[PDB]
């Protein structure tokens, strides 16, 4: 007894296969998945006639197709993606304040905050898998996007997470080649040194939440023994992410794009998303609250940008 099915790694290039109904899928295809569900140790049923299956890349054609779609050669990626997708497809993705959020489940507070942020900054992903899922996420079908985010970050469903580390991984898979940042550090003793950063390092900074303060100057130890001052010289990027350890901060409407609120201890806390629309909105998964002012524990703030040059001589 034999049925005919499709195997794929990208759900674009399908490959017809013949499968013996007396052997498990793993004995003929290796690890095999159906809509994220592991069917490796399952004998083929009759309802599987014509359906499409994801398989781990076992030959060169599937390896090339897998990279062109996911931009990774890690053999385990597809499995971690499918294993995460089996859960994220059960989450609810309500529209909250014109954005796609996530109803709370499996400790996804940080994923919801990252998803809401990604929808408010200008970003193009290099892997076609990410870009396709990015689009479907804006339309409300964010399951594949969240599953891919977990896979690219080497995190699993249930694990707690950091929003800044998550954003950092995603930027590494985004087209930020045009982004440039020139910095200058003035040291009374040693002197002046001007560096330029490209890529992800041009849009992320750890230290202060204020973009204005970064323009004026921040205090940084010099390699000589004096506390030097660093300031921003040029910034060519569509946005900037300013992160700092959680501290009480005042967000003023219209001066920022969005922000991450963190309440709790290191590696054990709750995330909330603050966005600046006509007023200030706070999105906590499926819950929404509005207020004209906001003071609270903020760890990330996102600002819009295009081209900046300093007036400090
Ligand atoms: C969400 C949990 C969830 O879904 N819920 C709802 C519930 C209440 C029922 C539980 C979730 O996933 N939360 N994430 C975490 O709990 C883990 C956070 C984490 C993970 C890995 C690395 C770092 C962090 C983390 O704690 N990040 C925050 C932003 C943080 C906090 C501090 C901090 C807090 N208090 N102190 C004294 C320090 C510090 C830092 C930080 C980053 C870098 N540095 C030094 C340069 N400090 C980050
Ligand atoms: Cl790549
Ligand atoms: Cl669940
Ligand atoms: Cl990439
Ligand atoms: Cl207004
Ligand atoms: Cl802004
Ligand atoms: Zn790539
Ligand atoms: Zn589940
Ligand atoms: Zn010095
Ligand atoms: Zn206002
Ligand atoms: Zn929550």
Swiss-Prot record:
Tell me what the record says results from residue 90 to N.
In strain: Beta/B.1.351
Q: What is this protein called in UniProt?
A: Papain-like protease nsp3
State the gene name recorded for this protein: rep
Organism of derivation:
Severe acute respiratory syndrome coronavirus 2 (2019-nCoV)
Q: Which domain of life, per UniProt? A: Viruses
The record's LRR repeats, renumbered to this chain, cover 115-137
Residue ranges constituting the Peptidase C16 domain according to the UniProt record: 69-313
- Whom does it interact with, and what assembly results? May form homohexamers. Interacts with N protein.
Q: Where is the active site?
A: 109, 270, 284
- Which stretch of the full-length chain is present here? 1566 to 1878 of 7096
Localization recorded for this chain is: Host endoplasmic reticulum membrane
**Chain sites annotated for binding Zn(2+) 6:** 187, 190, 222, 224
- Function of the protein: Responsible for the cleavages located at the N-terminus of the replicase polyprotein. Participates together with nsp4 in the assembly of virally-induced cytoplasmic double-membrane vesicles necessary for viral replication. Antagonizes innate immune induction of type I interferon by blocking the phosphorylation, dimerization and subsequent nuclear translocation of host IRF3. Also prevents host NF-kappa-B signaling. In addition, PL-PRO possesses a deubiquitinating/deISGylating activity and processes both 'Lys-48'- and 'Lys-63'-linked polyubiquitin chains from cellular substrates.
């Amino acid at each position: 007894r034999t049925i005919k099915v499709f195997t794929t790694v990208d759900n674009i290039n399908l490959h017809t296969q013949v499968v013996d109904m007396s052997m498990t899928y793993g004995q003929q295809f290796g690890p095999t998945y159906l809509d994220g569900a592991d069917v490796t140790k399952i004998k083929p049923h009759n309802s599987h006639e014509g359906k499409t299956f994801y398989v781990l890349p076992n030959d060169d054609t599937l390896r090339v197709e897998a990279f062109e779609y996911y931009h990774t050669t890690d053999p385990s990626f597809l499995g971690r993606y499918m294993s995460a997708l089996n859960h994220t497809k059960k989450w609810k993705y309500p529209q909250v304040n014109g954005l796609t959020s996530i109803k709370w489940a499996d400790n996804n507070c940080y994923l919801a905050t990252a998803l809401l942020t990604l929808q408010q900054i200008e970003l193009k992903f290099n892997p076609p898998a990410l870009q396709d899922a990015y689009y479907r996420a804006r339309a409300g079908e964010a399951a594949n996007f969240c599953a891919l985010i977990l896979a690219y970050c080497n995190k699993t469903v249930g694990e707690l997470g950091d929003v800044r580390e998550t954003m950092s991984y995603l930027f590494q898979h985004a087209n930020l080649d045009s982004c440039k940042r020139v910095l200058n550090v003035v040291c009374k003793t040693c002197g002046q040194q001007q560096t330029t950063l490209k890529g992800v390092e041009a849009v992320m900074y750890m230290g202060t939440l204020s973009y204005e303060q970064f323009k004026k100057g921040v205090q940084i130890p010099c390699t000589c023994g004096k506390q030097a001052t660093k300031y921003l010289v040029q910034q060519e990027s569509p946005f900037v992410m300013m992160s700092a350890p959680p501290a009480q901060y005042e967000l003023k409407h219209g001066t920022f794009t969005c922000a991450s609120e963190y309440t709790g201890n290191y590696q054990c806390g709750h995330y909330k998303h603050i966005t600046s629309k006509e007023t200030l909105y706070c999105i906590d998964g499926a819950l929404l609250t509005k207020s004209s002012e906001y003071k609270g524990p903020i760890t990330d703030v996102f600002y819009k940008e295009n081209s900046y040059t300093t007036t400090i001589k």
